[PDB]
Structures are given as C-alpha cells and as structure tokens.
Design a protein around this ligand. Structure first.
Ligand SMILES: CCCCCCCCCCCCCCCCCC(=O)O[C@@H](COC(=O)CCCCCCCCCCCCCCC)COP(=O)(O)OCCN
Length: 284
C-alpha cells in the first residue's frame, strides 16, 4: 500500500532537512539542473558514479531527486544520465530498483521528453540484461537517445549551456589514440585504445545492442586500478585490473609502444601518492 502521496507525506513529517546527511547530497552534486535544450525544456543531470550502494539510506536519494523536480515536473523536461566509470559498486538492487517506478505521481513519468545516456560501458549492458524483466517499459522506446561522441551532444543541447562534471570533461583531452587495434577474448572485436594523462580508455569500435538499440561501449580504467603491465609478444599484451578477475589481453602491431605508454602514466601515479607503503596484503 505504497503510492506517491504516502511517500511524500512520510518524508515531510520524518523531517530530513537537518539530518546532516541530506545536506551533503547537495554538495556532492549527484542530481542537479542546468541549461535548456533546443526545444526549450530544462535539463537535469544525474552523475551515476557518485552513489555508493550501501553508505546512505536509499530513501534519501529519492527524496532529494523528487524535491528538485516539483517546480518542473508539471511540464516537459529532459534528463542527461552520465555513466562514466560506472561499476558494480554503485548499483541498485531489486528491492530498491522497483521503488523508482511507484514513487512519483503518474504524470511525472509521461512528461519526460527524452533521455540522453552518456558513456555506457560493458558492466551496464550486463546489468540491463539481468534486470530486463523490470525494464521492459524502456525496451525499444524512442525516448532513449545514446550519445557516441561529445560533438553529437551539441545537436540536442546547444554548446555553452552543457554543464557536465568537471571530471568528465577532463577525460577527453591530451589523448593518444591507437586506431584499428583488436581485443582478444572468447570473441574478439575491434577496439581503439586511448591513453590520456590520468586514465586509459578502451573505446569499442563496433556498435552493440543495448535495450534494443545499437551503441558503442566505452570503458575507462584509471591508473590506480592498473596492477600488471607485461608484453608477452609484440603481437599481444596483457593488462590486469584490480577486482575484475581475469586480465584483459589485446593484440596490436606495436603492443610494445602502447605498453610503454601505459607504464609512464602508472609510474607517475606511483610517485603521486604520498603514502610510503601499504601494510599487509589482501588475499581472496
Ligand atoms: C519519473 C521521473 C524519474 C526521474 C528520475 C531522475 C533520476 C534519474 C536516475 C536514472 C538511473 C536510476 C533509475 C533507473 C530506473 C528508472 C525507472 C523509471 O522510472 O522508468 C520509467 C520512467 O523513466 C523515465 O522517464 C526516465 C528513465 C531514466 C533513464 C533510465 C536508464 C536505463 C538504463 C540503465 C540504467 C542503469 C543504472 C545503474 C545504476 C545507477 C519508464 O517509464 P514507464 O512507462 O515504465 O513508467 C510508468 C511506470 N508506472
């Protein structure tokens, strides 16, 4: 017996404005409004990789999202979802994922004009497949728009109005592209490794079906997550990532040149961290 009105009433009396954990949600900037699109509707951003799946009460996030939509959700609006560097540590669960469908007034769902998903990656696609039963409503919908490059965003949201997180923008500068590479797995597929100053981006060069739509799957591995860099052969090199299990092996004509480039970034981070040395070793 849960509806949009009871949830709204419950939070109000269960006062949360002075919790000192509801305030931090604003500074963290998980959900905020910025700019307007060509059609003239306001645009809201959702930074997906700022939510830790077990550190705050889930109901607080819903209330914060709701409280910033009341003045606007009576008319059409648009949402930009930023999935940069999203992983299993910031997922929703079935108990908490199904709440999002039964908490807002029924017309709030209809006013959503379009959705712009940004920087999808492999984990998200697998996450969608597992929960495909719930997300059947979104299957094949025409309101989902997938962005392939930052330039395409200009068409829908005009430049000088887009406000993405400062971190997200920094991940598209000083790039060192290596086109035509190939990824070695159970089923290989073209990729294009890029090695910026801070992190390594494995941008797939082939479109794949996500929620019934073809799209590219860009993946980002940060320096701190890089553990092993080796060159088995000039044809192939292998990378090991923390907590990801099996290492990733790729084939390129100049793997040694690419392998050298990654080492430079890793070495600089080693100097960057001030801590002398960690204590003990984690074993699984
Ligand atoms: C109603 C307004 C909702 C505003 C939400 C703002 C915050 C965005 C957060 C997006 C990620 C987390 C929530 C994802 C589930 C949202 C489910 C939902 O509300 O879906 C309905 C409305 O959705 C929308 O209008 C916008 C959908 C947002 C984008 C969804 C992306 C899905 C792709 C995978 C996301 C993986 C996220 C991983 C964890 C962060 C679909 O329409 P319907 O016909 O089923 O509704 C009638 C139900 N009685």
């Amino acid at each position: 017996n849960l509806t949009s009105s009871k949830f709204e009433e419950f939070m109000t009396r269960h006062q949360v404005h002075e919790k000192e954990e509801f305030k931090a949600l604003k500074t963290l900037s998980i959900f905020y409004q910025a700019g307007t699109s060509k059609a003239g509707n306001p645009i809201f951003y959702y930074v997906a990789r700022r939510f830790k799946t077990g550190q705050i009460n889930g109901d607080l996030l819903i209330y914060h999202v709701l409280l910033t939509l009341k003045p606007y959700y009576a008319k059409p609006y648009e949402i930009v979802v930023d999935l940069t560097h999203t992983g299993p540590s910031n997922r929703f669960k079935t108990d908490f994922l199904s709440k999002w469908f039964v908490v807002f007034p029924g017309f709030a769902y209809d006013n959503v004009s379009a959705v712009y998903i940004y920087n999808c990656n492999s984990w998200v696609r697998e996450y969608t497949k597992y929960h495909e039963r719930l997300l059947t409503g979104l299957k094949g919908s025409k309101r989902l728009v997938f962005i392939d490059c930052p330039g395409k965003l200009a068409e829908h949201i005009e430049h000088e109005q887009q406000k993405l997180p400062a971190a997200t923008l920094a991940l598209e500068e000083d790039l060192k592209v290596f086109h035509n590479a190939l990824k070695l797995a159970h089923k290989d597929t073209k990729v294009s490794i890029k090695v910026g100053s801070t992190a390594v981006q494995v941008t797939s060069a082939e479109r794949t079906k996500v929620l019934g739509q073809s799209v590219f799957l860009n993946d980002i591995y940060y320096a701190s997550e890089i553990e092993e860099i080796c060159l088995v052969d000039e044809n192939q090199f292998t990378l090991t990532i923390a907590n990801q299990g099996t290492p990733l092996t790729f084939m390129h004509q100049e793997c040694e040149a690419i392998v050298q480039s990654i080492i430079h970034i890793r070495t600089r981070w080693e100097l960057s961290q001030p801590d002398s040395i960690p204590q003990h070793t984690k074993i699984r």
